[PDB]
Amino acid sequence: NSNICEVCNKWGRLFCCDTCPRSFHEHCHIPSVEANKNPWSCIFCRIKTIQERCPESQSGHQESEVLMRQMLPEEQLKCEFLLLKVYCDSKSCFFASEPYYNREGSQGPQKPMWLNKVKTSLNEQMYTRVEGFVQDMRLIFHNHKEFYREDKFTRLGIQVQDIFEKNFRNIFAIQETS
Ligand SMILES: [Zn+2]
Ligand SMILES: [Zn+2]
Ligand SMILES: [Zn+2]
């Protein structure tokens, strides 16, 4: 196994996957690394199994169909994995915890949103469709772009949204387009 967390790239108290060489801090893995279970398989491994069991699940899909899917166990997992792929980028730090808004010439968003809030919402099974999860993720970046206006810091929101969107297209096998 690797000697650093796959998500945050630090050493520490690491749990090792049994079916691949990745390792995780307990609360870096999503869902949080399960108490017992030997062997244990990480989210990466679980997602690869879904694909292998249903190879056709990689054929292209329309986003509108994906968003309307109910949050059954496989869709729950895919959203957890997509959330985790965002936290894998170090720039996710800016969007992880609850924000506050006091900048001359801007007003804060009507509906603040942050990664740890989405993480809790997933854990508590608060989303009934993929659309709920995707809307909250996209709201994070949209709030950031609107608030920061012409400050160059707006770019961090574009950057992390691009990581989200690429991974959304991969994980949910969205049909490729120009
Ligand atoms: Zn970690
Ligand atoms: Zn694994
Ligand atoms: Zn099949």
What residue segments make up the domains of the chain, in order of their start?
1-59, 60-178
Calculate helix-pair angle for 130-148, 115-123, nearest 10 degrees.
170
Kindly give the distance from the C-alpha atom of residue 47 to the centroid of ligand 2, in angstroms, as a whole number.
Answer: 9
Task: Tell me if 29 sits within 8 A of 42, measured CB to CB.
Answer: yes
CATH number of the structural domain 60-178 = 1.20.920.10
Give the H or E element holding residue 156.
Answer: helix 154-171
Kindly give the distance from the C-alpha atom of residue 64 to the centroid of ligand 1, in angstroms, as a whole number.
Answer: 33
Q: Give the number of the ligand closest to the Cα of residue 44.
A: 2
CA distances from 24 to 3, 50, 93, 107, 108 (A): 9, 21, 17, 38, 35
Structural resolution in Å = 1.5
Round to whole Å and give the CA distance between 81 and 46: 10
DSSP state of 176: P
Kindly give the distance from the C-alpha atom of residue 54 to the centroid of ligand 1, in angstroms, as a whole number.
Answer: 31
Coil vs helix vs strand at 138: helix
Q: Do domains 1-59 and 60-178 have the same CATH topology?
A: no
Kindly give the distance from the C-alpha atom of residue 3 to the centroid of ligand 3, in angstroms, as a whole number.
Answer: 36
Exp. method: X-ray
CATH of 1-59, picked from 3.40.30.10, 3.30.413.10, 3.30.40.10, 3.40.50.1360, is 3.30.40.10
